[PDB]
């Protein structure tokens, strides 16, 4: 939701998490599949130059 | 709302702008920020992870 503002001391402000509006969902990160696969395969074919 | 499962509520008391008086406040801290204070078997005396 928001930066709920708690006041501490003579003028110090501490910002925290207030409510949550909406439902709860998970935090994800998305990578494309085939781009990752052939980039990984290119690293593989460039890594067999050192290991025979 | 009874179904968050990653963030706790964690109400506490704190010092206001007058250092004589204290007030009751609440937040929503994330779960890896918080460790239990093992002075008993009660799972309600939680604390912040940086306090030691």
């Amino acid at each position: 939701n928001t930066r709920k503002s708690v006041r501490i001391g003579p003028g110090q402000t501490f910002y925290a998490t207030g409510d949550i509006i909406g439902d709860i969902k998970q935090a994800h990160c998305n990578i494309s599949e085939e781009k990752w696969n052939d980039t990984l395969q290119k690293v593989g074919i460039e890594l067999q130059k050192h290991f025979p | 709302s009874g179904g968050v499962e990653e963030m706790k509520n964690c109400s506490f008391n704190t010092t206001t702008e007058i250092r004589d008086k204290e007030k009751k406040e609440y937040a929503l801290f994330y779960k890896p920020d918080i460790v239990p204070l093992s002075e008993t078997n009660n799972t309600s005396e939680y604390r912040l992870i940086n306090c030691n």
Partner: antibody
Framework: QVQLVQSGAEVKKPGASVKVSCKAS????????MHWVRQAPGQGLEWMGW????????NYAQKFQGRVTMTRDTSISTAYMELSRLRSDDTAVYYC????????????????????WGQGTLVTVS | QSALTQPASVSGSPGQSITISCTGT?????????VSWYQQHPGKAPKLMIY???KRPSGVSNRFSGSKSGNTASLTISGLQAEDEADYYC??????????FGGGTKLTVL
């Protein structure tokens, strides 16, 4: 196929509480949102807050907070409503409807895509 | 944040197109494109006509069409018959997981 059945018509006194049930059959009940609406006779429909039958999460609309509670039960697969402190214009018809898909990665709560409905419940007060 | 602004009623002769519209608040309709249209027959449950501003559901004839332009949202029907004796309702997202409906447009055939 698919069914959304509710209870029969009820008459009540002001200041009481009324319980409205909505049973879903024919599909996996814990995989979709449920939104409820209320229609006074003569005027249009009126939204009420939704329910998440997986984790029991609740959100309610404005001018309804405090006097409505919405629960679910996955063993009987039925959503319940307890509405206390009735008032004179609450003689109406109550519907339950199926919402969006529980996506686990995107917020599909307020998506206004209601496909299947119940038969309606008549609630009268005097 | 009241109900969406909707006309009172419209009248339509059979066999001609007619357009009905809602207007609202830019924070509700003018930002999010999650606008749906429902219709009601007197006595039974309502039935959905459109999901998005224009993306067709199943089990409906290829006759309704929806559009969104800024604040305004509109439904056009073409070649209307007497089977559409219903009243129409807007349905919109509003933020904070709240849904705002509309007033209602009674449709009378000739």
């Amino acid at each position: 196929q698919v069914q959304l059945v509710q209870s029969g018509a009820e008459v009540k006194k002001p200041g009481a509480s009324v319980k409205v049930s909505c049973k879903a059959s024919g599909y996996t009940f814990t995989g979709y949102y449920m939104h409820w609406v209320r229609q006074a006779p003569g005027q249009g429909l009126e939204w009420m807050g939704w329910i998440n039958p997986n984790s029991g999460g609740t959100n309610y609309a404005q001018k309804f907070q405090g006097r409505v509670t919405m629960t679910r039960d996955t063993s009987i697969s039925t959503a319940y409503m307890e509405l206390s402190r009735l008032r004179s214009d609450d003689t109406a018809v109550y519907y339950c409807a199926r919402g969006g898909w529980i996506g686990l990665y995107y917020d599909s709560s307020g998506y206004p895509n209601f496909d299947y409905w119940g038969q309606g419940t008549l609630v009268t007060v005097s | 944040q009241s109900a969406l602004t909707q006309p009172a009623s419209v009248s339509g002769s059979p066999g001609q197109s007619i357009t009905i519209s809602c207007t609202g608040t830019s924070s509700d309709v003018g930002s999010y494109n999650l606008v749906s249209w429902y219709q009601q027959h007197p006595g039974k449950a309502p039935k959905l006509m459109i999901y998005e501003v224009s993306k067709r559901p199943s089990g409906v004839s290829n006759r309704f069409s929806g559009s969104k332009s800024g604040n305004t949202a509109s439904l056009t029907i073409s070649g209307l018959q007497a089977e559409d004796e219903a009243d129409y309702y807007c349905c919109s997202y509003a933020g904070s997981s709240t849904v705002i409906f509309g007033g209602g447009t009674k449709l009378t055939v000739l």
